[PDB]
């Protein structure tokens, strides 16, 4: 037969004598992957981390439609209330999340192999596949086994497509947060602003950029309605677009070079350094043009050792512009562009 894995269970006192030398089994490239995974279907907890370890190896198909016992570590004390509470009261969670977390995550690898159980439940919550009505509280492993083996979620397209949906959900979320955190690390590394203003900038960025409305919009855009990846109903998530275009306008305009000079600079009246990651494949001219714009704005503001002061102000004004950043900063390790009648003040 095909190579499958099972999670042992028993109503009474799961121990070695019950293991003997009956069982209660309740958990039995892309296009091709879900095709074969559907073709498979029809219509003990312990760490070696490895969430489950096999006990032994060994008519069987009927045990997956009735949950009949098949007559001849740390999961020796499993409880039905345990499983019901820990894997949610929701049937879809109780089947899919259990199957993926205990069995599929390790055997299939990927990013989801490292996410904890609550992350898997959060992914499965927005796995809104249609709910086929169930014709028929759970008290023992027999009841939960009858509930899971006859479940619509333990057979066919849903069980075939859950792990791929997992991978795709982590991919989308990580890509969004990665772009936003790359910008955050950019503006973090070299911004030489006062302490309280730096702290409030970090707070406002990470909070208002990830306010509950944007998270709700992202989750709704990531909601699926068909287990088929080919027939996936996911929509383009606007989270990154909103976070970058819609709100850094306000932050950059408010927390700008004009206010910085007007407050933190007291006048009493320029060599570019590049840290290379990889060569840039028009970009250079655009970057120099935006550098020129930033320097010109700083010069206009400053003109209604002093060389160090003017270089520092030029560097700050060049950082505060977005065009120069999108032009060159994606390619540079660090952003100390400039090596450092009296421009004075605290620093």
């Amino acid at each position: 037969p095909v190579e499958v894995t099972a999670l042992y269970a028993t109503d009474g006192c799961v121990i070695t004598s019950s293991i003997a030398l009956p069982v209660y089994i309740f958990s039995y490239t892309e296009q091709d992957r879900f095709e074969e995974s559907r073709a498979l279907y029809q219509a003990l907890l312990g760490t070696e981390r490895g969430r489950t370890r096999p006990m032994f190896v060994c008519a069987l198909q009927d045990a997956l439609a009735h949950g009949t016992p098949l007559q001849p570590y740390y999961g020796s004390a499993q409880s039905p209330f345990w499983f019901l509470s820990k894997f949610g009261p929701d049937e879809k969670s109780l089947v899919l999340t259990t199957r993926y977390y205990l069995l599929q995550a390790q055997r299939l690898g990927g990013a989801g192999a490292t996410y904890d159980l609550q992350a898997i439940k959060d992914i499965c919550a927005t796995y809104a596949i249609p709910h086929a009505p169930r014709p028929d509280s759970l008290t023992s492993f027999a009841a939960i086994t009858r509930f899971c083996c006859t479940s619509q979620y333990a057979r066919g397209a849903a069980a075939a497509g859950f792990p791929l949906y997992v991978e795709r959900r982590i991919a989308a979320d990580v890509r969004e947060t990665s772009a936003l955190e790359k910008f955050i690390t950019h503006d973090r590394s070299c911004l030489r602003v006062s302490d309280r203003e730096f702290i409030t900038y970090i707070y406002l960025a990470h909070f208002e950029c990830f306010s509950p409305p944007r998270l709700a919009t992202h989750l709704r855009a990531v909601t699926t309605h068909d287990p088929n990846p080919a027939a996936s109903t996911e929509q383009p998530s606007p989270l990154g677009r909103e976070a970058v275009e819609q709100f850094f306008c306000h932050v950059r305009a408010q927390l700008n070079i004009g206010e910085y000079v007007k407050h933190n600079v007291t006048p009493r009246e320029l060599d570019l350094d590049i840290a290379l990651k990889e060569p840039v494949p028009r970009r250079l001219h655009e970057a120099l043009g935006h550098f020129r714009r930033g320097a010109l704005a700083a010069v206009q503001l400053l003109f209604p050792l002093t060389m160090r002061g003017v270089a520092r102000v030029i560097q700050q004004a060049v950082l505060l512009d977005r065009d120069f950043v999108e032009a060159i900063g994606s390619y540079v390790k660090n952003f100390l562009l400039i090596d450092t009648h009296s421009l004075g003040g605290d620093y």
């Binding site: 820990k86 904890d116 973090r188 302490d195 702290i199 990470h206 998270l215």
Partner: protein
Amino acid sequence: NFTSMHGVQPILKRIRELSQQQLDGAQVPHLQWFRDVAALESPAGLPLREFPFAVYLITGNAGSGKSTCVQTINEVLDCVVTGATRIAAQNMYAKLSGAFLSRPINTIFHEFGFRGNHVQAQLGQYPYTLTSNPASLEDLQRRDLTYYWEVILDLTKRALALPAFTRSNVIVIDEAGLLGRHLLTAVVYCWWMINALYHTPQYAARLRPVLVCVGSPTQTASLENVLTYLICNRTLREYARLSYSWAIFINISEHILSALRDPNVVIVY
């Protein structure tokens, strides 16, 4: 939880990287040194011996995700979760058992052998003076042992005449701000005790003890604890590579300002 779920993954990556690094033969301590130390009574026979170790700091305001990060680390990585206090261990058990399975969590004191007769030990009895500056970590551990010498010596005496430190090498110490700085070295030393005394398979594997100190250094002020002694001391800042092994969970503190200024420490929202 919506974004911490993704921000916490590099924390697990770095902890796994730390937990995997092996030590050279010249770096792993040998039981002959420890027996020689036991055979003496005064610190006069303690040379410039080094105890390699690694530390992972996780700081932040009051419960802004540090406990949940400990939960995720326990649920994914092989860590021996401990507590600074009895209440800390009870809180950690309450957090973990409500989600997944963790064995009964003991205090790090209970882990390394701290017992009742250890309470009455005269702490700070023998004198020490720093030799040079920046003080070599071999001198730092020497001083930490000297400050805590009675307890260390009684531990060694008991050890000569199943410890959980054989289980793994990543030890999660919650509320690490409540622990004295000297205890830090003791824990590492205590770790080696077990891994030297029982000839543990990690000893044959040349594995190094890794600490995951989770707490707020702001809540404790001297009238310098482990978190503060690691953030401030230049020697530990250099040896531990703390710039690349540090997490801050955020919802004057010049120290945490400099932490946020450092680009290479992870901050989780």
